[PDB]
Structure 1
Amino acid sequence: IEEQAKTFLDKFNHEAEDLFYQSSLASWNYNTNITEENVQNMNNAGDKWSAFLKEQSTLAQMYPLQEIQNLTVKLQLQALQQNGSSVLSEDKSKRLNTILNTMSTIYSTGKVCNPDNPQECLLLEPGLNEIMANSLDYNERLWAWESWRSEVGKQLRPLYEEYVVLKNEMARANHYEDYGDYWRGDYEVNGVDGYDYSRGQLIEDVEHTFEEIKPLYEHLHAYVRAKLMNAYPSYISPIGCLPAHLLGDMWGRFWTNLYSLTVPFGQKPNIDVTDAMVDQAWDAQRIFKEAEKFFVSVGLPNMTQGFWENSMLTDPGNVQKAVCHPTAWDLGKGDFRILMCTKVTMDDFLTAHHEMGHIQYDMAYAAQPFLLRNGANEGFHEAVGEIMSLSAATPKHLKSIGLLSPDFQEDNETEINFLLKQALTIVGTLPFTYMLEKWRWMVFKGEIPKDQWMKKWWEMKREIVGVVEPVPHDETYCDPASLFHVSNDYSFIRYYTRTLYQFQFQEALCQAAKHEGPLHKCDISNSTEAGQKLFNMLRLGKSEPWTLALENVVGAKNMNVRPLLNYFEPLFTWLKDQNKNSFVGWSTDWSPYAD
């Protein structure tokens, strides 16, 4: 009966909040002060949380799921009843964890040695990522691109084939058709009177939104190709694809390292307020106190006053071994801490606004039950953090926060320099993200057999992304598995939808703050009505369907690409005038070796 499930969850909601607390408090003491008497302090305290949750999970199947009427207590029950693994045979369950540990340690400890000196050998993160991000030598970028895929990616090919079979068995025992349908279960919504969403409906909404970005991406692809021919003459065709090893990093995920070759007006400095911070003696604490004044300006609460003692805003005065990585912690019981090692720079002035945005999202849904204290889907949590960073990087906000000469002149040449640096990171990553999840979805359902994995991968690079390989690759390579998110078992569609939600939030908040100009000049400071539009979504958590959360801000029930294109229309107008003598589009027949 349904009233027994309510009494089940309230014993759960008070044993979990304490056991999650000290399992996360011990993870704080390891992260900010590393010993090994802290790693053993967090492994036993971490396993008491994991052993407790599988005990309550096997108690949750005593209650049926379709004999429930209240939507909230049904949502908590389905998130706890989830079997996930453990549906496999107990010798297949240990084979899967052996593969996931072997693929993870090949990626982090794989070395590449030089053919002129076999005694010098580079790892990926120090040394191989620096060549792909800084070099202008064609022959050295071609060496680092091919040798990472032929010496490390060939080890992951027999391991990734066994990984697909075991993950499809686990997904079909949980009544999905494949493992790709299991990943799309985040966006599913069942029976809330007009707000429903199918797991197959996500596939059409991604492909419908993508064919409206292809006019903008084609003009960006044509402008970068014309600028790369001056940097690498006799290597690039003026009507063809771009070679895969000249894109700024190892995989071509972000084009953000191509800015020094593709800058529109290099005689205008892109605005940088780092010298005005060290001329006014701003400490470590000023960067967060101006960040807290931004959020109280819009109508959001202060920091919790436990935030100021418990947090560790710099690396300590001790030479203290403590993972230095910006992050926002939500230990529980209303205890919010930020861990970062901040330097006096406009870079960490902006990520301070980003990391505080995770905190203000966390402080808002802290009145829901324990199992609904996440973002409404996997994409909302990063998207609310980046609309705080866009509003703080504008020169309108910088001159009113005291950091820009009240006699500063923004010219139309510097807005093109700023918008093109945004499009190399935002627009340049959207066909990479769409192509990769489309390839992984077709591998799991079996539309691509294993004798055509690397054949269909490079046909989709030339057609969707416009990127050609420099050396042909047969079915002994596995080039997707040489990325971190593929070999470490992560979903990748959250980076596509976060980019679309980010400009839907920003365009909906700037109509409430009564903006008049272009969308990229907007700032939501001093408003109250925009914050009330934002706070009505922030407090929902997972208690409502995410389509119901979007109408509280945007006014629509689906993700939309038209606010993303309105942000880049000053660039799209300027790009169509720079490509009057160029060719827009590419040919899938040209190759850098096929002459």
Structure 2
Amino acid sequence: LVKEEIQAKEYLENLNKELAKRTNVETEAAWAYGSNITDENEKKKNEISAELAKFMKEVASDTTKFQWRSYQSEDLKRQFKALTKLGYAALPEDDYAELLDTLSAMESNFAKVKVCDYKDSTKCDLALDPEIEEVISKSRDHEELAYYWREFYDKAGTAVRSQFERYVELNTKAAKLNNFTSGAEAWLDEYEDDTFEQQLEDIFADIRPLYQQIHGYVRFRLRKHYGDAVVSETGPIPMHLLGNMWAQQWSEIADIVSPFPEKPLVDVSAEMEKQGYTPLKMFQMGDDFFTSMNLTKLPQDFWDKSIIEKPTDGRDLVCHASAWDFYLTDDVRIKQCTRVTQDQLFTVHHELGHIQYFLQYQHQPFVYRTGANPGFHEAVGDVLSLSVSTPKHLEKIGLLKDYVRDDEARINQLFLTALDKIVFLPFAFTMDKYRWSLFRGEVDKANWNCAFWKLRDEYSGIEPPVVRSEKDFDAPAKYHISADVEYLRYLVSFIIQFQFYKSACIKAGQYDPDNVELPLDNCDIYGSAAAGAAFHNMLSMGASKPWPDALEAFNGERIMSGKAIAEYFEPLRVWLEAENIKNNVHIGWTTSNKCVS
């Protein structure tokens, strides 16, 4: 049994190596398909996934040869337990193949959406990225906005209802084969905490009043721009006016809702273009931020194999930005259809945070080469982006000029940041609240579409521009819903990234709550080896320990907390509460009239 444990340790070392080797090729096939959507690439991706699922079944069976619950090493026991968890690979081979086909159909559908131009309906080659996203972000023609909203949701959402239904069924079947009640419990398993969902309810409830104030002010300002017939005083905000196809962040309309329109609003896109920025330069700058913190420089494979601008050959691909670990040493890549904008610069850092994480844990055994939890993975790059976005940093790198950081400019900047960070929280929560409700069998198929919009109303106080019904199916028009990517990770990320940022800022000498010269919202951790060390300590652990141990390695904390994010926006909360009372701004909303059961 001491002998058996020694044998089990060698068995796991070899198994992890083999899993990394096989997953490398699965990842190559997935990369090929995602960068070039073809029936041939789809078939190879799905065959290799099927072969790997069959291997995982064998692995799970082989683990029963070892009396691993009697072993001394908690590490070995953790590895064995992770290797017993089959997920979708628990499905019978025919069901697994059908699930893969279903997922590919939805992903292909999303990637291939083309719409007709509003001004000339004979031009029908407008894609989400970049053409439709450009219109939704920049047009202030409410009819044009509503047209693109409808065309996109009809094609990206409604077209895949039947595939989505079958996916829900197979996801549920898989979950029950793994002894989870549903796919909701399967997803929640990744956080290794039986109170995790309630913890999020509690944090969300604390931040919700600030969201209500932001919502009310934005509606007030939208109504002043568009008039009562377009934006009602008391109803949910028509979502097509919020600058984003899913209304998940509202910073693209900052020029119609900024607190002080006479005072500066940071948008460095023009200066980036004036200075001849390219996607390459943007990625080089991100790399430089990480190396400035004494973290790992991007390896040669990254530069040689990444795709950092949209192809011009007219093939179909998934343009949704992503970061890829190929499970060797130093083979890590990003695929991004990069444009030279402030928003895209943040996305670059977001994706490079994933890459940094891959590099930091690449010597862990294969089973531990992943995030402490899914939210940790999403948070890394956003911590850097918070620094990148500060007037302090943008002035230093020459992208922001003639900027006086007076009280009004500060409110503009905090408000802009809140349009990205606070507004996203109810959005992110609803993406999984909706799917969990379907996974759990709590909504009859007859009510699936209005269940989606009811949640979007309840939590975000937004609604479609036009009346929808159960003849539409709108949820899959969000990438992650069509792609079967869990979304709670982003809610978790948006909370914990402020915990990481606050701690890194203190370690860098960039934040002191008692010093007016060092406010949290102007902290730049660029150049801080001390902040980098904290990242190294956490990120190098991968998934070797439960996430509270990874957090503790960073800053001694073990608890997920909304204190930091509230602290960041406290100056905005004070101003905004006073401003809404001053202007008699209506808070809250009536139930939406936009979904017919």
- What TM-score comes out, normalization by structure 2 length? 0.82
Q: 1:420 Cα deviation (Å)?
A: 2.0
Give the aligned partner of residue 474 of structure 2. Answer: 479
Q: 1:431 to 1:19 in 2, by over 3 A?
A: closer
For the Cα contact (< 8 Å) 2:13–2:365, is it kept in 1? Answer: no
Question: What is the match of residue 560 of structure 1?
Answer: 561
Query: Equivalents in 2 of 1:344, 1:118: separation in Å?
Result: 28
Judge which range, 138-147 or 247-256, deviates more.
138-147
CA-CA distance at 1:563 after TM superposition: 0.7
Q: Which residue of 1 aligns with 2:515?
A: none
Over the matched positions of the two proteins, sequence identity in percent amounts to 35
Cα offset for 1:351?
Answer: 5.4
Check whether the contact 2:330–2:359 (CA below 8 A) recurs between aligned residues.
no
Tell me if structure 2 keeps the 8 A contact 1:365–1:540. Answer: yes
1:207 aligns with 2:180: no
**Displacement after TM superposition at 1:544 (Å):** 0.8
* 2:66 match: 63
What letter is aligned with 1:561?
A: G
Alignment of 1:412 onto 2:407: yes
Tell me the residue number matched to 1:3.
6
Q: Contact 1:243 / 1:592 at 8 angstroms: preserved in 2?
A: no
Q: Residues 402 and 592 of structure 1: is their aligned pair in 2 closer, same or farther, counting only changes over 3 Å?
A: closer
Change (3 A) 1:544 1:165: same
Q: Do the aligned partners of 2:353 and 2:377 also contact (CA within 8 Å) in 1?
A: no
Distance 1:302 1:32 in 2: 25
Cα contact 2:264–2:403 (8 A) shared by 1: no
Structure 1 gap ranges (5+): 189-196
User: Is 1:444 paired with 2:439?
Assistant: yes
2:472 is paired with a residue whose SS is coil
CA distance in structure 2 between the aligned counterparts of 1:135 and 1:342, rounded to whole angstroms: 21
Could you tell me how far apart the structure 1 residues matched to 2:113 and 2:348 are?
Answer: 34
CA shift, 1:400, in A, is: 4.6
Deviation at 1:175? 0.6
How many angstroms apart in 1 are the aligned matches of 2:327 and 2:93?
Answer: 34
Question: Could you say which structure has the higher helix fraction?
Answer: 2
Equivalent in the alignment of 1:191: none
C-alpha displacement at 1:19, in angstroms? Answer: 4.8
How far, CA to CA, are the matches of 2:122 and 2:273 in structure 1? 44
In structure 1, the residue matched to 2:534 is: 533
Q: State the match for 1:266 in structure 2.
A: 261
1:193 maps to none
Go from structure 1 to structure 2 and tell me whether the alpha carbon gap of 1:286 and 1:80 turns closer, same or farther (over 3 Å shift): same
Q: How far is the alpha carbon of 1:310 from its aligned partner?
A: 4.4
Contact 2:46–2:100 under 8 Å retained in 1: no
Matches within 5 A, 1:325-364: 328-339=323-334, 353-364=349-360
Residue 97 (structure 1) shift? 3.8
Aligned equivalent of 2:243: 248
Is 1:548 equivalent to 2:549 in the alignment?
yes
Correspondence for 1:505 among 500, 504, 507: 500
The residue that corresponds to 2:390 in the other structure is 394
Which piece of structure 1 moves more, 89-98 or 445-454?
89-98
Q: 1:484 and 1:271 mapped to 2: Cα distance?
A: 28
Q: Determine the structure 1 residue equivalent to 2:590.
A: 588
After TM superposition, give the deviation of residue 356 of structure 1 in Å.
Answer: 4.3
User: What secondary structure, in the 3-state scheme, does the structure 2 residue paired with 1:213 have?
Assistant: helix
Worse-superposed segment, 453-462 or 51-60: 51-60
Tell me if the contact between 1:454 and 1:475 (Cα under 8 Å) persists in the aligned partners. yes
Q: Secondary structure at the match of 1:457?
A: helix
**Partner residue, 1:233:** 227
Q: How many residues align?
A: 582
Find the aligned partners of 1:309 and 1:455 in 2 and give their Cα distance.
45
Residues of 2 paired with 1:428 and 1:146: CA distance?
A: 23
Residue aligning to 1:523? 524
Change (3 A) 1:450 1:390: same
Deviation, 1:203, is 1.9
CA contact (8 A) 1:513 1:524 kept: yes
Greater shift, 106-115 or 569-578, is seen at 106-115
- Asked if 1 retains the 8 angstrom alpha-carbon contact of 2:371 and 2:542, the reply is yes
Give the root-mean-square deviation of aligned CA atoms.
4.3
Report the Cα offset of residue 289 of structure 1. 6.4
| Deviation, structure 1 residue 532 | 2.9
Code of the residue aligned with 1:2 in structure 2: it is E
Q: Does 1:140 align with 2:141?
A: no
Shift of 1:71: 1.9
Aligned residue identity for 2:551: L
CA distance, structure 2, for counterparts of residue 160 and residue 28 of structure 1: 23
TM superposition score normalised by structure 1: 0.82
Larger radius of gyration: 1
User: What secondary structure, in the 3-state scheme, does the structure 1 residue paired with 2:420 have?
Assistant: coil
Counterparts of 1:69 and 1:282, CA distance in 2: 55
Q: CA deviation at 1:387?
A: 1.1
Q: Is the 2:502–2:520 Cα contact (8 Å) retained in structure 1?
A: yes
Instruction: Give distance in 2, aligned partners of 1:427 and 1:36.
Output: 41
Distance in structure 2 (CA, Å) of the matches to 1:33 and 1:436:
28
Q: CA deviation at 1:105?
A: 4.0
Residue 75 of structure 2 aligns with which residue? 72
Q: CA deviation at 1:205?
A: 1.1
Matches within 5 A, 1:105-124: 105-109=108-112, 121=124
1:172 matched to 2:176? The reply is yes
In the alignment, the residues of structure 2 paired with residue 445 and residue 215 of structure 1 have an alpha-carbon distance, to the nearest angstrom, of: 29
Residue pair 2:323, 2:355 contacting (<8 A) in 1 also: yes
Residue segments in structure 2 that go unaligned for 5+ positions in a row: 513-517
Per-residue CA deviation, residues 15-48 of structure 1 (Å, 9 max, x unaligned), is 4455555666788899999999999998998887
Partner of 1:211, secondary structure, is helix
Kept after mapping to 2: 8 A contact 1:379/1:497: yes
